[PDB]
C-alpha cells in the first residue's frame, strides 16, 4: 500500500504532510512511501532527507497510484482529478461552507477524512491538528508582534536609562493564548489576559499572567467596560478566538483601538474567519492611528518547519488507527472525520 | 539659546534626536526647543506630544534660527546649507570615508561633534551612542532571527510531540552580543558564544550560555541553526568570521544574522539592506538595526545627546570635529 505525500500548491502554504520521523513511522507500518518532488522545501526538508527516512521521491503522476494521499490543505479543483477512485485523502479539509468541493470529492469516488473534525477528548490529543497548529500560532503571534513593534519587549536597564517592559494583553486563553502568554512572559513583558471561561483564570494565572475580569448579560456589559479600559493602557494585543466552523467574534473595535497610544500593535489570529479585530485585513499589516494591525494568513505556517513537524505526527498517528489497511466506516474516529466515501458524501 | 530637532531625511531612518523626556530636559537646561514637523513620526512621537512637552513645531526652514542642531545622521549638503554659521551640530556623523562632508561643514562654519567618537570611559557611559544602540541591536538581532527562521526558538512540548530548541551561536560578546545572548536565552534557545577577549567567557557563562574557545569554529557552526555576528569596529572594515564554506555546511533552513554588514560584514555573502537565501541559508543583513525598534532607540539616543550637551554648559576634544571654519579633529 502506497502513501503519497503531496507538495502543497497554495502560494501561502509552506507546510507539508510528511516529516522525517513521520515517514519512518509510515515505513514501520508497512507502507510504500512516496514524496512529491520538493514537498518539504518550504518546510526545510530536502528530498534527500526523506529518502534517508525510507521514502522514495516521486511526482504528481504517482499520486494516481497512491492508496493514501497525505496532504495539508483540501485538494483543489485541479488536483482531485489526479487521485484514484477509492483513494484515501487525509488533510485539513476546511469543510464548513465548502459543500461543492465536498461533493466534488465524493464525485471522484474518494474517501476523505477531515482532521479538524477530530474528537478533542484528552485521549486523542496526539492527533489534534487544531491544537498542534494553534500552539505554534500563539508563539508566532508574539514573534510577529515584537517584530512590528518599535519598542523592545523586555524592560532594559542601561547606562542611558531604562526602557520599560511592554504591556502585552492576550484575549482568548485556549491553546494559542496560553502559548502567546508564555512566549510574551519569557521575553519579559508585563502580561495580562482574558477569557469568557472563568476556568481559564486558573491557567492564565499559573503562567504568571493577570486574568482580566469583573469578579462576582449583566456581567457581559460591565466586562466590556473593564476591557475597553484595560486596552487603552496596553502596548500589544493578541486575539486568539478563532472558532472553527464559526464566524470570529468581534473582540476589539476601531473605537477601542483608537484609545491606544500610537506605536501599539495588535495581532488578529482570527482574521481568516472574519477577525476578532475590526480593522484587520487578511494577509496584511495595516496601520491606523499609529496602531499596527497584524492579520497574517496561515500563522503557524510562518514556522512551517515546526508546524509540519507536528502536523505530520498528527496524520500518521491517526492513520495507524486504520491499519495492513483495514478501512472501517463504523469506526469511531473514522465516523467522526469521514467526510465522503464510496462516491457518497457521508 | 535655541535647539532644533531635525526630521531625519534618510529613507531608512525612523529614529529622532529628541524625545518627550529629552525635550523636557533641554528646556530645563535653558534651551527653547524647535521640533521639525514630523520628526518623531517613525519613532511614535506625534507632533502634538512634542508641543505638549514645551517644544514649538517648525519646518526645515527654521533650522537656521538654532544655535544647536540635534540630529541622528550627518547633515546632507542641502541640510547644512540651511544652518547658520556658528550653530552647533551633534549627530552620528559617520566621519570615516566622508571627510569631504566634514570639510563642507567646516566651510559652513559649523561646530560639529561626532557622537560615535565618545571616549569609552566609565564617566561617559550615559552618553555612549555606540553602546546604547548596540544593546538594542543585539536584542533586535534575535527577534529578526526568530522572524526568518522556520522553526520556534524555544523547545516546546505539545500533545503532538515536542519541537526542539533552536541552537544559537553568537560571535562577539560585546554589548550587542551580550544582549543577543540574553534574548536568545529568554526565548529558551540552546545558546553558545565566542570572543577573543577571554574575560568575555565569564560574562557569557553568567548569562547561562556556553563559551567556545578557526577549525573548532567551522565545526561548531556546522551544528548551529542560527548564528549572529556582532564584530563591528568603527571606522574599520569588519572582520570575516564566517565563510561561504563554513556556511555550505549548515543544515538547510539555518539562518545567520550579520550585524557588521554596514562595513563589509562579518559574514561572507552578507548584503547590506537584504535577507539573502543561498544553499537554503538566509543571511540577514538589515541596516540601522537598532532603528528597527526606533521608538525605544530614540528614547536612549535622545538621552545620550542631552546628557552630553549638558556637560558643555575632554569629551569635546574627542568628539569635536569642526569649529570656527576649520576641521579641528586631529584624526582628520
Q: Is B208 on the interface with A (CB under 8 A)?
A: no
Q: Is B33 on the interface with A (CB under 8 A)?
A: no
**Which grid cell sits at A5?**
505525500
Q: Class of A2-136+303-341 per CATH? A: alpha beta
Tell which CATH classification among 3.40.50.1980, 3.40.50.720, 3.40.630.10, 1.10.240.10 matches the domain A137-302.
3.40.50.720
Residues of A in Cβ contact (< 8 Å) with B149: 303
What residues have CB less than 8 Å from B314, skipping those under 6 apart? B119
Q: Is B14 on the interface with A (CB under 8 A)?
A: yes
Give, in order, the Cα–Cα distances in Å from A250 to each of A63, A224, B17.
Answer: 42, 12, 40
**Cβ-contact A286, B318 below 8 angstroms:** no
| Closest chain A residue to the Cα of B301, Cα to Cα | A160
**Which grid cell sits at B93?**
556623523
C-alpha B188/C-alpha A194 separation (Å) is: 25
Q: Class of B137-292 per CATH? A: alpha beta
Whether B132 sits inside 8 A of A186 (CB atoms) is: no
Query: How far is B108 from chain A, CA to nearest CA, in Å?
Result: 32
Assigned architecture for domain B2-136+293-323: 3-Layer(aba) Sandwich (3.40)
C-alpha B175/C-alpha B134 separation (Å) is: 6
B-contacting residues in A 218-277 (Cβ below 8 Å): 261-263
What residues have CB less than 8 Å from B206, skipping those under 6 apart? none
Query: How far is B100 from chain A, CA to nearest CA, in Å?
Result: 32
- Helix (H, G, I), strand (E, B), or coil: what is residue A302? helix
Give, in order, the Cα–Cα distances in Å from A36 to each of A171, B97, B121, B319.
Answer: 39, 53, 61, 62
What method did the depositors use to determine the structure? X-ray
A vs B: CB pairs below 8 A = 133
Whether A160 sits inside 8 A of B46 (CB atoms) is: no
Q: Residues B249, B252, B255, B260: is their CA dihedral positive or negative?
A: positive
Residues of chain A with CATH 3.40.50.720: 2-136+303-341, 137-302
From the list A7, A318, A299, A269, the residue with the least C-alpha distance to B159 is: A318
Residues of chain B with CATH 3.40.50.720: 2-136+293-323, 137-292
Instruction: Please name the member of B127, B159, B186 whose beta carbon is closest to the beta carbon of A132.
Output: B159
Q: Residues A190, A193, A198, A202: is their CA dihedral positive or negative?
A: negative
Instruction: Please name the member of B147, B150, B151 whose beta carbon is closest to the beta carbon of A147.
Output: B147
| Torsional class of B167: left (φ above 0), alpha (ψ -120 to 50), beta (otherwise) | beta
Other CB atoms within 10 A of residue B98 CB: 14
C-alpha A196/C-alpha A240 separation (Å) is: 12
Amino acid at each position: 500500500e502506497i502513501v503519497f505525500i503531496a507538495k502543497e500548491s497554495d502560494p501561502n502554504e509552506g507546510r507539508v504532510a510528511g516529516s522525517v520521523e513521520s515517514v519512518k513511522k509510515l515505513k514501520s507500518l508497512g507502507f510504500d512511501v512516496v514524496v512529491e518532488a520538493g514537498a518539504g522545501l518550504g518546510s526545510r526538508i530536502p528530498d534527500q532527507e526523506y529518502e534517508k527516512a525510507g521514502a522514495r521521491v516521486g511526482t504528481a503522476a504517482d499520486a494516481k497510484t497512491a492508496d493514501v494521499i497525505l496532504k495539508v490543505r483540501r485538494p483543489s479543483a485541479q488536483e482531485i482529478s489526479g487521485y484514484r477512485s477509492g483513494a484515501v485523502v487525509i488533510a485539513i479539509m476546511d469543510p464548513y461552507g465548502n459543500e461543492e468541493a465536498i461533493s466534488a470529492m465524493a464525485g471522484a469516488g474518494l474517501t476523505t477524512f477531515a482532521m479538524e473534525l477530530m474528537p478533542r477528548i484528552t485521549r486523542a490529543q496526539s492527533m489534534d491538528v487544531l491544537s498542534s497548529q494553534a500552539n505554534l500560532a500563539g508563539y508566532q503571534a508574539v514573534i510577529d508582534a515584537a517584530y512590528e513593534y518599535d519598542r523592545a519587549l523586555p524592560m532594559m536597564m542601561t547606562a542611558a536609562g531604562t526602557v520599560p517592559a511592554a504591556k502585552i494583553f492576550v484575549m482568548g486563553a485556549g491553546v494559542a493564548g496560553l502559548q502567546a502568554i508564555a512566549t510574551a512572559r519569557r521575553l519579559g513583558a508585563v502580561v495580562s489576559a482574558t477569557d469568557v471561561r472563568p476556568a481559564a483564570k486558573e491557567q492564565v494565572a499559573s503562567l504568571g499572567a493577570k486574568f482580566i475580569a469583573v469578579e462576582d448579560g449583566e456581567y457581559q456589559v460591565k466586562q466590556a467596560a473593564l476591557v475597553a479600559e484595560h486596552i487603552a493602557k496596553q502596548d500589544i494585543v493578541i486575539t486568539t478566538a478563532l472558532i472553527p466552523g464559526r464566524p470570529a467574534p468581534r473582540l476589539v473595535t476601531r473605537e477601542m483601538l483608537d484609545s491606544m497610544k500610537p506605536g501599539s500593535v495588535v495581532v488578529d489570529l482570527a482574521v481568516e474567519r472574519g477577525g476578532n479585530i475590526e480593522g484587520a485585513e487578511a494577509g496584511k499589516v495595516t496601520e491606523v492611528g499609529g496602531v499596527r494591525i497584524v492579520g497574517h494568513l496561515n500563522v503557524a505556517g510562518r514556522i512551517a518547519a515546526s508546524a509540519s513537524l507536528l502536523y505530520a505526527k498528527n496524520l500518521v498517528t491517526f492513520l495507524e488507527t486504520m491499519v495492513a489497511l483495514a478501512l472501517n466506516m463504523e469506526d469511531e474516529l473514522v465516523k467522526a472525520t469521514a467526510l465522503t466515501h464510496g462516491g457518497a458524501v457521508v
